[PDB]
Design a protein around this nucleic acid. Structure first.
Length: 200
RNA sequence: CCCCCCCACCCACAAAAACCACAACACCCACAAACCCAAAAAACCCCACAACCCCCCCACACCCCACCAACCCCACAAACCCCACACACCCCACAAAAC
């Protein structure tokens, strides 16, 4: 339900086939034969919006991440729930690791007034951004949430800068990420150009 | 058109690796005599009856020119963006998102 968009048909079928083969082979047994999953998805495309359905998926993913299980393969549906709507924060942490910076040092390179609000927004204390298996990883899926201050839009300038540097270094993930048009992409690209020059 | 965890060469038993090896061998050489897919002789332009030798010609003629009026595959007028009701005007937008 989440993976809806332009030109994603062959790809939805491929993930669905991977899903079906997982659940048709041991420790799971084939109960729906083939192509049933795609057809139910056609009628169940907006099931992601349903709050209880999202809540349960997140709960399942939290349980399977901490405890290893025979049916741990169920996580393949619920993996999307982890770090949901926190792409900004996820992009930042990868950027720190790919660039080989201490995160603090990385923020020093953000030479613009606009980054200030975003830096405060994503680094607010008291949220378990520092705990390995906390409710935070599934916070959006679970009830304890609001619009995420960690989403690529909430931290639009930082997100743009990160992937613009990623594009300069040829990171495919950044090449295919969708740019936040509101948050001054042109200025972000210029700064990203210099930073990538330094890091490539 | 990112992700199940662990993981992460479409790496892996042993013994081993020239898609080497019986021996005899090793021109996908060879029967000899011979070794031009030469030769009877006479011949030797796929020359020649002769007249002839433009696939030239009746004459008048000789633009596959011509009735004249003519002669843009111009034209009624009004016209003349294959322009317009307003409202408008990203083939943008629920939210959440957004490898």
């Amino acid at each position: 339900s989440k993976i809806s968009g332009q030109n994603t048909g062959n790809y939805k079928t491929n993930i669905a086939d991977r899903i079906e083969q997982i659940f048709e082979t041991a420790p799971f047994v084939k109960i729906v034969e083939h192509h049933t999953l795609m057809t139910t998805h056609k009628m169940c495309a907006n099931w992601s919006t349903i709050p209880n359905f999202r809540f349960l998926a997140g709960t399942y993913d939290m349980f399977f991440s901490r405890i290893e299980h025979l049916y741990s393969a169920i996580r393949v549906g619920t993996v999307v729930t982890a770090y949901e709507d926190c792409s900004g924060l996820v992009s930042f942490t990868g950027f720190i690791k790919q660039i080989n910076l201490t995160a603090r040092e990385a923020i020093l390179y953000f030479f613009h007034k606009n980054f200030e609000e975003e830096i405060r927004r994503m680094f607010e204390p008291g949220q378990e951004t520092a705990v390995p298996h906390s409710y935070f990883i599934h916070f959006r899926s679970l009830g304890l949430s609001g619009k995420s201050p960690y989403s690529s839009n909430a931290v639009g300038h930082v997100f743009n800068l990160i992937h613009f540097v990623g594009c300069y270094m040829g990171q495919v993930r950044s090449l295919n990420a969708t740019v936040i048009a509101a948050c001054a992409p042109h200025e972000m690209s210029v700064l990203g150009g210099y930073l990538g020059e330094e890091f490539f």
